Symmetry: C4
Subunit: 253 residues, 4 copies
């Protein structure tokens, strides 16, 4: 109980964070050195020991945490969970994902990610509309072009892949649409509207995420530093209205 | 009259919407399975029955609607009409367009689309300017390059297609402009200004649609949930001016 | 003097504008039909008469204008001048530029263009910075790569062209930078920073034009329709401060 | 002391600035003429004298400055330092960088750059997140594809280069991902999420820089011209609250 408190004070320490950071980076650097195919077996052996170590430190850390907060207190945070899964999973193939923990552990990084996650609900409808345009476009392109262009359109999967490439504008004309039009001369009537509508919609999607993510992140940075945020101008004005109701009611008296 | 009301209450139900949704998706999934060229004839036969069914359910739905609102009440909504045409047309070649009904039937999706449609008027002039730049650029490119580069510029249609590809930046240089400059060394004086002006204008077009669409959609989401929207800060301030005129007029008294 | 006034009333008419519009479009459509290389000589002859006619109507129009406003009144407008040059020039090679007159004659189109022109001053410094980055990058790329890659970098002109292509991201890697790195393995140290800095700066340029152009255009549309614009919230608030100074000064009394 | 003041008045002069500008441009134009490989040795000799001259003028300038402000006063400005290094370095290989001095010497250009530098801190976390996604993606692509695609993925450096090309969307599909999928058919499960996440994040990075840079630059342009800036609407409203507290406190009296 005094122990809990002294440990929670270690954990919530800034030096302790710096140390977990340093270990994430180290574990990351070593997984990077291990991509190098030319390494001696002793080189690889060291590196792989450096990694067992990193992972052991994380076990202690997570222990120090589940303890100083209890099972239900730790698992109350999605970040703790994420930290827990990522570390636990290594105890049972892309280990480099452990480097994501730079996000869970560094607060300003965590707040960028939380802004983005929190913005996802409010673009869900733009994303659904994009999804529907894709699905429809892919069925039509399969039926229209699948028999004459089967590597690009031969089945629904192929069509979706190709249309995604088309929406990114990558070789959409020299590589896809001009060859298509040599066999189907009006194919531009399909492809040009597809491009116009998906590029508009995907930028609508991007801009909505970003504008909202940034506003959320900024409120969170405010709360984290002063315990509150700026009131919306919206509600500042309403309050000004209140002081003017209590002046018109004191002026009638 | 009590029937009408009990049916309108079915139709406007949330369970009924969920069911029409489920049928759109089903009809959609089956039109997707039917792109698959390898299907047995019995497989295709089933799928095609699953589709007759979906379309029959939509007939009933639309019936339940034209009735519970009458001919003129139903046809008062552009969405009802859209629903009606799309379903009626199937009763007389891209049937997959029926999946658009996910937009007409799901309200938050409908509001995204309405925001976009409603924003179109206020960019009509940017779009016209883009149209004029294209038309002019295509006439000039036809006259300048049509004889030496006829696959890309040989007629007005070819020129427009090529210029659209150029504005999207797709192979504009390695694939179009460098080959053009080997014959017409100053062609960069045409193509580089075209690119600068159309990319600026089309992004002006995109940003205007999106900024307006989003503001409209957000007002509509507000009205749908509370029957009104936020007053513009603009007009909140004017009202503050009013309470200050009735305080300066009570203070002169 | 009464004539002047009755003519100025014709000119400023909405039917007269519709008629000049109709003639611009006609002249435009015919210059378009004339790109078609397959035309009979009689077909071309007609079309070319349709064009002499269009241009004659414009002479009358401009006459009706220089008269009903006098030499100095007409030439007081940049649009009148533009109209005058474009029409006069045809009386002494890209005639299709006459279609620009759709912009000079249609007011909502004119206001889009005026917004863009008026926004140019306030991005002049971002544009200059882009210009400087290009100039410097092109000198360095010429010296670094000109001897080994002379078609892309062999002189300053070649370098600028190539770098413009690189900033648009068009084949920048498969077509330019990977071949360059086969001879100069660290060339990515030049090209990747160039891309990062020019794409950031050119989007800064684009966004500044567009945000300002749109705000200006919107003020102009306001003035054109009601003779004034919205006061900036900025100055609305200052005025609110004024009414509160005359309430604190009446409250001290 | 009177000398200092009369020299500081020269230096801070508008004619003196115009003259340093003119010399930067000249030095720049000559370094440009010197890229031209065809020059006579006498042509190159002149040009190289024109450059010694330019650099001498800059020595005097910098002297006139270090003097009229003293060692610690001059070196108090990052721009003076930059000017000093750039000029001093030439006294000990990309000399064309001297043209950057157009930025240090022209104030509206300096303010664009200061806005951008000052905005960098507040996107540091978005940039770090992009850095982490890249690092992780490059380790995984090396392990997944390095043995079968070693020119693109054969080591970490190769992977990062390729992924940067992929994020710019340049030939990402016809040139990289389709060839990859012929050997590793599910590679789209890696590449398409990479593209979606990096393009979203890099645009978040770009938009944050630009929005902040522009706001900072605009405040700086305000201060430079009137010695102060616009107060944030934020704080204008708070002040309005103050005058309403001194009216409710005078109205209770
Ligand atoms: C909105 C984004 C939608 C993106 C969806 C991507 C579709 C998945 C691609 C896929 O499933 N393939 C087959 C996997 O079996 C890819 C094919 O393109 C492949 O057959 C090629 O090598 C020819
Ligand atoms: C603002 C967007 C403007 C887009 C307009 C697209 C133009 C329509 C293209 C067209 O009509 N073609 C001919 C159809 O007959 C396409 C040609 O490019 C075709 O002949 C090629 O296969 C060579
Ligand atoms: C900020 C935008 C800067 C754009 C500037 C474009 C540079 C002008 C290009 C130019 O002057 N060329 C030579 C004209 O004589 C083009 C060469 O690329 C040409 O020689 C090729 O065919 C090889
Ligand atoms: C976020 C941006 C990250 C950009 C990072 C660029 C990575 C640096 C590229 C590099 O170091 N190379 C090797 C230099 O030794 C480039 C290789 O691609 C090269 O070997 C090719 O010619 C094959
Ligand atoms: F070598 C490691 O550095 C990386 C990481 F993740 F390991 F820390 C990074 F920071 F660049 F991303
Ligand atoms: F298989 C069907 O799913 C699609 C649709 F339209 F049919 F519902 C979608 F939702 F993904 F778009
Ligand atoms: F055939 C003519 O139509 C064109 C123009 F300019 F001539 F009017 C346009 F409107 F599309 F641009
Ligand atoms: F020839 C010189 O002109 C250039 C510079 F930098 F030298 F001044 C520029 F202005 F275009 F960039």
């Amino acid at each position: 109980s005094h122990m809990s408190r002294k440990i929670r004070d270690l954990i919530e320490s800034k030096r302790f964070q710096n140390v977990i950071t340093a270990i994430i980076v180290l574990n990351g650097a070593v997984l990077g050195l291990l991509t190098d195919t030319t390494l001696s077996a002793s080189s690889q052996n060291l590196l792989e020991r450096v990694d067992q170590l990193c992972l052991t430190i994380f076990i202690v850390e997570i222990s120090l945490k589940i303890y100083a907060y209890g099972v239900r207190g730790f698992f109350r945070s999605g970040w703790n969970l994420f930290d827990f899964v990522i570390v636990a999973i290594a105890l049972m193939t892309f280990r480099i994902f452990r480097v994501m923990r730079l996000v869970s552990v560094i607060p300003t990084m965590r707040r960028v990610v939380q802004g983005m996650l929190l913005a996802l609900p409010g673009v869900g409808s733009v994303a659904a509309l994009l999804t529907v345009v894709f699905y429809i476009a892919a069925v039509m392109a399969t039926n229209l072009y699948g028999a004459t262009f089967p590597e690009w359109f031969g089945d629904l999967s192929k069509s979706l892949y190709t249309l995604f490439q088309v929406m990114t504008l990558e070789s959409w004309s020299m590589g896809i649409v001009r060859p298509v039009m040599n066999v189907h001369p009006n194919a531009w009537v399909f492809f040009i509207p597809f491009i116009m509508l998906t590029t508009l919609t995907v930028l609508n999607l991007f801009i909505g995420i970003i504008v909202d993510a940034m506003a959320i992140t900024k409120e969170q940075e405010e709360e984290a530093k002063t315990g509150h945020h700026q009131e919306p101008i919206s509600q500042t004005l309403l309050h000004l209205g209140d002081r003017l109701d209590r002046i018109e009611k004191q002026l009638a008296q």
